[PDB]
Scaffold this active site. Structure first.
Site, PDB file in Angstrom:
ATOM      1  N   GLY A  19      30.355 103.675  59.613  1.00 21.13           N
ATOM      2  CA  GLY A  19      29.268 102.720  59.803  1.00 21.13           C
ATOM      3  C   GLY A  19      27.963 103.351  60.249  1.00 21.13           C
ATOM      4  O   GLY A  19      27.859 104.572  60.382  1.00 21.13           O
ATOM      5  N   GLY A  21      24.860 104.263  62.760  1.00 17.80           N
ATOM      6  CA  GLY A  21      24.620 104.620  64.152  1.00 17.80           C
ATOM      7  C   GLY A  21      23.181 105.046  64.357  1.00 17.80           C
ATOM      8  O   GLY A  21      22.899 106.232  64.541  1.00 17.80           O
ATOM      9  N   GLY A  22      22.269 104.074  64.315  1.00 13.93           N
ATOM     10  CA  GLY A  22      20.836 104.339  64.441  1.00 13.93           C
ATOM     11  C   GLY A  22      20.294 105.183  63.300  1.00 13.93           C
ATOM     12  O   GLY A  22      20.221 104.732  62.156  1.00 13.93           O
ATOM     13  N   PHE A  23      19.931 106.421  63.629  1.00  9.06           N
ATOM     14  CA  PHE A  23      19.399 107.390  62.670  1.00  9.06           C
ATOM     15  C   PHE A  23      20.497 107.914  61.743  1.00  9.06           C
ATOM     16  O   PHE A  23      20.209 108.512  60.702  1.00  9.06           O
ATOM     17  CB  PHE A  23      18.769 108.576  63.421  1.00  9.06           C
ATOM     18  CG  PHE A  23      17.754 108.178  64.466  1.00  9.06           C
ATOM     19  CD1 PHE A  23      18.150 107.548  65.649  1.00  9.06           C
ATOM     20  CD2 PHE A  23      16.404 108.453  64.278  1.00  9.06           C
ATOM     21  CE1 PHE A  23      17.212 107.182  66.617  1.00  9.06           C
ATOM     22  CE2 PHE A  23      15.456 108.093  65.239  1.00  9.06           C
ATOM     23  CZ  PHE A  23      15.862 107.457  66.411  1.00  9.06           C
ATOM     24  N   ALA A  24      21.751 107.672  62.121  1.00  4.88           N
ATOM     25  CA  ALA A  24      22.901 108.273  61.454  1.00  4.88           C
ATOM     26  C   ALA A  24      23.687 107.308  60.576  1.00  4.88           C
ATOM     27  O   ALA A  24      23.813 106.118  60.890  1.00  4.88           O
ATOM     28  CB  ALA A  24      23.834 108.894  62.489  1.00  4.88           C
ATOM     29  N   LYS A  25      24.199 107.842  59.468  1.00  4.96           N
ATOM     30  CA  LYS A  25      25.332 107.257  58.767  1.00  4.96           C
ATOM     31  C   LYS A  25      26.553 108.030  59.264  1.00  4.96           C
ATOM     32  O   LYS A  25      26.536 109.264  59.291  1.00  4.96           O
ATOM     33  CB  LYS A  25      25.195 107.406  57.248  1.00  4.96           C
ATOM     34  CG  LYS A  25      23.915 106.837  56.649  1.00  4.96           C
ATOM     35  CD  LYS A  25      23.035 107.935  56.051  1.00  4.96           C
ATOM     36  CE  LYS A  25      21.734 107.380  55.469  1.00  4.96           C
ATOM     37  NZ  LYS A  25      21.936 106.182  54.595  1.00  4.96           N
ATOM     38  N   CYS A  26      27.599 107.316  59.673  1.00  5.21           N
ATOM     39  CA  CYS A  26      28.760 107.958  60.294  1.00  5.21           C
ATOM     40  C   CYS A  26      29.995 107.995  59.397  1.00  5.21           C
ATOM     41  O   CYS A  26      30.288 107.025  58.702  1.00  5.21           O
ATOM     42  CB  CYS A  26      29.088 107.289  61.628  1.00  5.21           C
ATOM     43  SG  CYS A  26      27.736 107.350  62.815  1.00  5.21           S
ATOM     44  N   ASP A 135      21.902 104.656  79.246  1.00  2.39           N
ATOM     45  CA  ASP A 135      22.236 103.472  78.451  1.00  2.39           C
ATOM     46  C   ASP A 135      23.714 103.142  78.458  1.00  2.39           C
ATOM     47  O   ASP A 135      24.354 103.037  77.402  1.00  2.39           O
ATOM     48  CB  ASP A 135      21.711 103.558  77.014  1.00  2.39           C
ATOM     49  CG  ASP A 135      21.607 102.185  76.351  1.00  2.39           C
ATOM     50  OD1 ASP A 135      21.313 102.146  75.151  1.00  2.39           O
ATOM     51  OD2 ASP A 135      21.827 101.145  77.026  1.00  2.39           O
TER      52      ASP A 135
HETATM   53  C1  LIG Z   1      29.818 108.655  65.729  1.00  2.00           C
HETATM   54  C2  LIG Z   1      29.113 107.588  66.561  1.00  2.00           C
HETATM   55  C3  LIG Z   1      30.046 106.794  67.494  1.00  2.00           C
HETATM   56  C4  LIG Z   1      30.519 107.825  68.451  1.00  2.00           C
HETATM   57  O1  LIG Z   1      29.667 108.341  69.203  1.00  2.00           O
HETATM   58  N1  LIG Z   1      31.859 108.277  68.494  1.00  2.00           N
HETATM   59  C5  LIG Z   1      32.232 109.342  69.434  1.00  2.00           C
HETATM   60  C6  LIG Z   1      32.822 107.710  67.636  1.00  2.00           C
HETATM   61  C7  LIG Z   1      34.154 108.108  67.637  1.00  2.00           C
HETATM   62  N2  LIG Z   1      35.016 107.525  66.799  1.00  2.00           N
HETATM   63  C8  LIG Z   1      34.636 106.538  65.945  1.00  2.00           C
HETATM   64  C9  LIG Z   1      35.640 105.937  65.028  1.00  2.00           C
HETATM   65  C10 LIG Z   1      36.923 106.306  64.679  1.00  2.00           C
HETATM   66  C11 LIG Z   1      37.329 105.357  63.764  1.00  2.00           C
HETATM   67  C12 LIG Z   1      36.285 104.470  63.579  1.00  2.00           C
HETATM   68  N3  LIG Z   1      35.245 104.841  64.365  1.00  2.00           N
HETATM   69  N4  LIG Z   1      33.357 106.100  65.890  1.00  2.00           N
HETATM   70  C13 LIG Z   1      32.418 106.632  66.697  1.00  2.00           C
HETATM   71  N5  LIG Z   1      31.081 106.183  66.641  1.00  2.00           N
HETATM   72  C14 LIG Z   1      30.772 105.080  65.694  1.00  2.00           C
HETATM   73  C15 LIG Z   1      30.529 105.436  64.236  1.00  2.00           C
HETATM   74  C16 LIG Z   1      29.793 104.217  63.676  1.00  2.00           C
HETATM   75  C17 LIG Z   1      29.140 103.494  64.855  1.00  2.00           C
HETATM   76  C18 LIG Z   1      29.586 104.210  66.123  1.00  2.00           C
END
Ligand SMILES: CC[C@@H]1C(=O)N(C)c2cnc(-c3ccc[nH]3)nc2N1C1CCCC1
EC number: 2.7.11.21
Length: 284
Positions: A19, A21-26, A135
């Protein structure tokens, strides 16, 4: 898709999206040389073309990469190619406390203790590194497969500053303005404690003690620190709130005080929470 680190040779495999995450696509991202999966932020250079936003990720990376603690999201590695910045982080398969609270509305006291102890553990570690989170919110409490909590997202995080040289302007747009920040005193460790008080209130009641619109019209209510204390709260929970949301930052408890409050010491707290708790209210 194979992603290669042009500085090292190191190969990664990109999996499914996680999904925005601000500036990021994750995305899921596997390091092919241990076969471990990470949650990665992928930020195109286009999103960081301005010097200030370039400085923003650099700071986040600089601060996050030195942290090692069981209740802080574990920074793994970062690199860049011609297209993107990649930040690989501890994979937390059970999302965040924001997702959990959305499903549950409200948590039981033993669960609130379970989660809060872990938040306090990680925050303690940060504060002793003289790093302020700035935050703290449910969405930044990430939950792994084994229901363990990790504090993350260090995108407004900064090193502690003495009041005499401190930044006095609002940094980003946090979930929970303190009184002192609204009084242009800047953000100290006690401002993270605020923020924890707001978190605890929300866990137990399902809504914050003050409006979170960050509109100027809300400023007086926060800086008074006058709010509704619902009768549904048990007395110890009420008393602990009540201390963390002290108007004068000097009057707020220390982190060691917080976990030793009657709210924690006089109730049951179990060692391991079941994943059903993302879902369903646990048994008495
Ligand atoms: C990478 C950003 C944030 C995050 O900071 N972490 C550590 C994380 C860990 N596992 C996950 C994760 C494992 C399975 C689904 N999401 N997601 C994390 N996120 C999500 C990604 C999209 C919005 C925030």
């Amino acid at each position: 898709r194979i992603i290669v680190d042009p500085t090292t040779g190191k190969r990664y495999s990109r999996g499914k999206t996680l999904g925005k995450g601000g500036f990021a696509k994750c995305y899921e991202m596997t390091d092919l040389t241990n076969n471990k999966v990470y949650a990665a932020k992928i930020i195109p250079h286009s999103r960081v073309s301005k010097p200030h936003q370039r400085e923003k990720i650099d700071k986040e990376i600089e601060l996050h990469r030195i942290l090692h603690h069981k209740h802080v999201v574990q920074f793994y590695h970062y690199f860049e190619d011609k297209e993107n910045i990649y930040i690989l982080l501890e994979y937390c398969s059970r999302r965040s406390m924001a997702h959990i609270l959305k499903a549950r509305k409200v948590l039981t006291e033993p669960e609130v203790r379970y989660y809060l102890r872990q938040i306090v553990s990680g925050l303690k570690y940060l504060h002793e590194q003289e790093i302020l989170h700035r935050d703290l919110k449910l969405g930044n409490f990430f939950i792994n497969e084994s229901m363990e909590l990790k504090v993350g997202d260090f995108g407004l995080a900064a090193r502690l500053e003495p009041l005499e040289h401190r930044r006095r302007t609002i940094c980003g747009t946090p979930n929970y303005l303190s009184p002192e920040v609204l009084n242009k005193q800047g953000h100290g460790a006690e401002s993270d404690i605020w923020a924890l008080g707001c978190v605890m209130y929300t866990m137990l009641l399902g809504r914050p003690p003050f409006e979170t619109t960050n509109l100027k019209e809300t400023y007086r209510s926060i800086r008074e620190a006058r709010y509704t204390m619902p009768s549904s709260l048990l007395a110890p929970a009420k008393h602990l709130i009540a201390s963390m949301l002290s108007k004068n930052p000097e009057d707020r408890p220390s982190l060691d005080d917080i976990i030793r409050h009657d709210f924690f010491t006089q109730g049951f707290t179990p060692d391991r929470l079941s994943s059903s708790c993302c879902h369903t209210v646990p048994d008495f």
